Design a protein around this ligand. Sequence first.
Ligand code: DFU
Length: 437
Amino acid sequence: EIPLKYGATNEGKRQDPAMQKFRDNRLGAFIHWGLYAIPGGEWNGKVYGGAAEWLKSWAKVPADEWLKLMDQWNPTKFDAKKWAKMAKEMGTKYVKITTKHHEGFCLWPSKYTKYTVANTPYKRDILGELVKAYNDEGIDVHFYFSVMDWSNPDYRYDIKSKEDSIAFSRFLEFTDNQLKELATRYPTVKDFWFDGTWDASVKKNGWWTAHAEQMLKELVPGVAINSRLRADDKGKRHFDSNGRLMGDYESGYERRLPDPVKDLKVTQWDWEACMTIPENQWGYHKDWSLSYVKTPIEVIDRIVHAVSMGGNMVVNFGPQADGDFRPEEKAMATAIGKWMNRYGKAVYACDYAGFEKQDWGYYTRGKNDEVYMVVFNQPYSERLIVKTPKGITVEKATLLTTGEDITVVETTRNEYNVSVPKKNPGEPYVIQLKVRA
Ligand SMILES: C[C@@H]1NC[C@@H](O)[C@H](O)[C@@H]1O
C-alpha cells in the first residue's frame, strides 16, 4: 500500500448503536432551501433550465447582488410542525437539511457572517425550528454543508499564490468556526453531509478534511460523516489512494444507483444515495415542465433498489420561497407514505439479502432473517422465480398485507417458483419468505 497520514479512517462498517440507527432508518428526505428559492430558476425574465440552486452561476450574478435576495426572505407560510408532520406521514425516518448551500446563505443565525436568516425580514432561526420540530416527531436530523462558499471573499478554487494560501487558510478557519457552531447549537445532529469539496483548493488540503471529520466526531458522540468530505494525502477523494473508503459511508450515488448485478461491492460498506424528483432540480424551480418528472412508483423503485443493495435513499424536496411545498412534492410524500404504511416492513431496518437479482423486482433481508420479495414487474407467467444461495431453502411464502399463504413449488436445485397472489395487488407488493439454513 501507499502510506498516508490522511487516508482511510477505520476498517469496515461501524456497528455502534448510532450507525445502526443511521442504517436502519433507510429512508430520509432532503431539504434544499436557500435564497435560490426566491427567483426559482429565473433571473430578470429569463428562465434557466439548469438546476435552480446553481442560478447565480447560470445567470452570472455577482455575490453582492445574489445575496440581496435576503431582503426578500420572508417565508410567511413556513410552519416547522407541519413540515415535520408531512415527513412523519411520508414515513421518512430522517431529514437532511441544507444548512448552507453553495451560495453561502445560512439557515441558522451564524455569528461568523452577515449572510444568514437573522438579517432578513423573517429573522427567525429556520434550522433550529426544523431541528426541534423533526425531533419532536422522533425524526433524526442531518446537516448538509457546502464547503464551497460563493459568499466568502476568502474562498479560492485553486491555490495559485501566497495570497491564495493566506486567504484559504483563513477560509478553513471560518469553515471550522461554522462547523463547531452547528455542532454546539444543535447537539442532536446525527450527520454532516459535506458537499462542494471537489475544487483543487480542497484536494490540496486533504489534511483539513480528516481534521474536520475528527473534530466533529469529538464534538458529537456518534455523529456520522460522509465520504464526500474526505481527500487523502495525494488528493484522491471518497476512496483513498489505497482504495479504502474514507468517512463513515459512501455518498457518490447522486441521481444514479449501482447496478444490482454488477456492483455488489457496495454491500461491503455503508452508503447513501440521494435523488431529485425531476431530472436535475434540487432547489425550488418554478417550471417543472422543463424536464422529466418522476412518478411515485419510479421513486419507490429507487428506494427499494437502494435498500436491496445495503443502502439508504434520500428523496429531495425544494421548498417554495413562501415556506410551503409545491403540490407535486406533497403528492409524492403522500403517495410514498401510503406505500410505506403497507410495505415498510420490507424497508425499515432491512439490508442486502445475498440472493441473485431477478426481473420481477428486489429482495430485502429483515432483522430476523426474513426475506422480502418486493415485486415491481408482474410476470405474465404468474410465477416469480427465486434462486436461493447454496444451502438456503424456502419453507413458506406469505402475502405481507393479508397473511395469505402463497404456493411455493420447487423447480430445480436451489430454485423455486413463488406464485403471484390470486388477486393482483394493482401496485408494487411484498411477499415475505421464511427461509431456513
Ligand atoms: C445534492 C447535490 N450535490 C451537488 C450540488 O452542487 C447540488 O446543488 C446538490 O446540492
